[PDB]
Design a binder for this molecule. Structure first.
Ligand SMILES: Oc1ccc(-n2ccnc2)cc1
Ligand SMILES: Oc1ccc(-n2ccnc2)cc1
Length: 126
């Protein structure tokens, strides 16, 4: 069901939260080798999450579930804000700009926390 597909997508999102927090600890500790691996792992999770979200939005559209489509359009837009911040974070790591890395890291945490009420609202709407 589209609802069970959203729960699967929500779990992938929570996997990225977990890996992101370990990555933040590694960054603070200066373990740049770990950071690089976590960033690769996070890119794969976000690419997977985005694909599950697009499939869910398209299905809600085919089902005519107007409220769920509205919420998912808003939620996908916020996801892309997070993705842009992430990709900038990755560039700051490549460049050795720890000041920018810290900045982008905090921004991504705030974008994500803000988007969580909507994330829950979608589960209920599908
Ligand atoms: O697919 C995702 C979802 C949330 C993510 N995140 C939570 C906190 N900072 C990033 C990252 C990737
Ligand atoms: O709340 C978030 C967190 C991370 C996100 N992301 C990282 C890479 N692509 C999406 C998107 C939305």
């Amino acid at each position: 069901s589209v609802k069970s597909e959203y729960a699967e997508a929500a779990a992938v999102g929570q996997e990225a939260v977990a890996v992101f927090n370990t990555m933040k600890a590694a960054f603070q500790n200066g373990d740049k080798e770990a950071v690089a691996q976590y960033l690769a792992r996070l890119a794969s999770l976000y690419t997977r999450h985005e694909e599950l979200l697009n499939r869910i939005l398209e299905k809600a559209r085919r089902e005519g579930n107007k409220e769920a489509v509205t919420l998912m359009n808003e939620f996908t837009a916020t996801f892309q804000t997070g993705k842009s911040i992430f990709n900038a974070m990755v560039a700051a790591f490549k460049n050795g700009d720890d000041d920018s890395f810290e900045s982008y890291l905090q921004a991504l945490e705030k974008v994500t926390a803000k988007g969580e009420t909507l994330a829950d609202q979608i589960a209920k709407a599908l």
